[PDB]
Write a protein that binds this DNA or RNA. Structure first.
Ligand SMILES: [Ca+2]
Ligand SMILES: [Ca+2]
Lengths: 152, 152
DNA sequence: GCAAATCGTCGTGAGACAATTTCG
DNA sequence: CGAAATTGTCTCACGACGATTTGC
């Protein structure tokens, strides 16, 4: 529940609208009650020679980590509670991904009720459909419709 | 000289560091005193379906324009005076391209002297190399070197 | 059984120039 | 002569997922 400096948030909001990405995914996995995991991820991609900027974010945001993948690296935050805290404070300054942010927050706020009824779970999966819609989605496979293929 | 709002500057500096670009070029042209023109440019690129954002920058910067080039568009600003005013204010908030920003500022300020001496002008082209090196330059051809090739 | 991590890849959406032209 | 525009495009540097594993 760390509090972030406004100016920091202002700048980061901009940098995120540029290189950032708010992602919601439906992950097929048998070990889950409804055969799928709900996964929310905030990230920031950057050329690895500039990994330092991403490393600094780790210290500034206070959570998350940086992963390597060749010529590029990523700042990653998958932790639901800290993610909810971070986006809550970032959301008011975003402009290109403010809705995917508010959609992720709504998804988190609903997680519990969702693990209860197959319908709450599907409706939430409709939220993840909207997020992918908002982003420049191009390699998406598991949608809420595939989840609809739970009917059993 | 327009007086931009700090918060708009904070957010934009972040957006610029992400999708923006601060460019300094040496264009060979036999109409110029030293057979080359010095071109400085501030730009923000974005998928054209998201151009409203660039059109938005036109109205907020109060100068410059947007051009389409397929599925992608660009907010462009190359007017020397507006560029100086604009970059002087954005610079203190830049984190990734502050150096190129300040290089342009300095280039802009040495312009007239760079016009009365193949040496000043020579030195200035050396300022441009630096901006390119700082950037992820990958198709550059005309450098201060190819320009020293005037001394003949 | 679920949160969070590990490791990879598709197809761009950018960044960063070049070549040439326009016109006060 | 030169400030600014117009048009083109190379090479990524990203965005945005997917498959599977780890761990309590
Ligand atoms: Ca972007
Ligand atoms: Ca970038």
């Amino acid at each position: 529940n760390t509090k972030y400096n406004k100016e920091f948030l202002l700048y980061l909001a901009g940098f995120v609208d540029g290189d950032g990405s708010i992602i919601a995914q439906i992950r097929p996995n048998q070990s889950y009650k409804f055969k799928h995991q709900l996964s929310l991820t905030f990230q920031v991609t950057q050329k690895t020679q500039r990994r330092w900027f991403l490393d600094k974010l780790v210290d500034e945001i206070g959570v998350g980590y940086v992963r390597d993948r060749g010529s590029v690296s990523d700042y990653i935050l998958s932790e639901i509670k800290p993610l909810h805290n971070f986006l809550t404070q970032l959301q008011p300054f975003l402009k290109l991904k403010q809705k995917q942010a508010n959609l992720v927050l709504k998804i988190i706020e609903q997680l519990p009720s969702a693990k209860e009824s197959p319908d709450k779970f599907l409706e939430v999966c409709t939220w993840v459909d909207q997020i992918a819609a908002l982003n420049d989605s191009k390699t998406r496979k598991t949608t809420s419709e595939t989840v609809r293929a739970v009917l059993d």
